[model samples]
Target: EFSEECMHGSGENYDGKISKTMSGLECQAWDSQSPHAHGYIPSKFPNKNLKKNYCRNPDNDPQGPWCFTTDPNKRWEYCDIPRCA
Candidate 1:
């Protein structure tokens, strides 16, 4: 299981179960529209395997996988997943 937060190639395909931001904020559920509304449909990108609040790179962000944080002050935050050596 993905017990650790590791990624490869800018984490564009990292589907690990990390639900916290760099600032230690919990991630918002991908399907949840409350608190924050988004357009990244989970059904459209099944490869991302969007589940719970796990961090993912559904949008293939160049900076790496990120997620909508539950914190209202921060709309989004990049997950601190490092490249696997």
Candidate 2:
């Protein structure tokens, strides 16, 4: 599927290549659990396409796509998804 920088609706289907959080925090790999270990793995939802460390809305949060951060203090945070203009 073609990647999109901006998100639509809840962004649950957003497969963009963005890997940085809103605060510029590095996105922890979905497969890795070093700095942060939690659910929302790729295997959980095969259709979600939770690949790499790119931000995703695997949990289908109303706020949109997010990711676990490498920063231990932060843990997790919502990512920046430009509104489709």
Candidate 3:
């Protein structure tokens, strides 16, 4: 199940270094109940295994130095995969 707020992006593997960039910026189904569940954490040797940051939502593309963006008109729908269903 998803939250009342608009949710995007499927929380699957980070898709290598390319996907790790998706962290922190608010999307749809990210873990927002704990610390560091909203923003980008260094995917390196020193902090590769550290907890990541979390944002309120995903209103931007590059992510940059922002938590989430402001867009009241954005919305998302649920689409379960065959295995999960």
Candidate 4:
């Protein structure tokens, strides 16, 4: 099952790069060595200021399921991909 926020478009993988789209917005497929992925956001959103954080769902917020934070310095625990939700 997909979350409501992820319903905008099915994810696609090509030549080891991945792309995800949502809400009429699309981000180009990125290579593994790419420094960062890019996407669009509302003009006044605070997420534009985020940096050096990992994405997770610590609070289980209903609006979606994930959020980003700067706490928990240990990468072994928080950096695990399946734990994001």
Best by lDDT: 2
Instruction: Estimate candidate 2's RMSD in Å.
Output: 1.6
Q: CA lDDT of 33 in candidate 2? A: 88
Better of 1 and 4 by lDDT: 1
Worst 10-residue stretch by lDDT in candidate 1?
Answer: 1-10
lDDT of 2 by residue, 52-82 (tens): 9999998789999999999989989999898
Candidate 1 on 1-85: residue-level lDDT in tens? 6654689887767767889999899999999986789987688778778878988888778888888999977888998888888
Q: What are the Cα lDDT values of the candidates?
A: 0.84, 0.88, 0.27, 0.23
Candidate 2 wrong stretches, greater than 4 Å: none
Q: List the candidates' TM-scores in order.
A: 0.87, 0.90, 0.16, 0.18
lDDT of 3 by residue, 5-80 (tens): 3223432211111111132223332323232233433333322222233222223333221232222233322222
What is the overall TM-score of model 4 with all chains considered together?
0.18
Error of 1 at 32 (Å): 0.2
Q: Following a full C-alpha superposition, what root-mean-square deviation does model 1 have from the true structure? A: 1.8
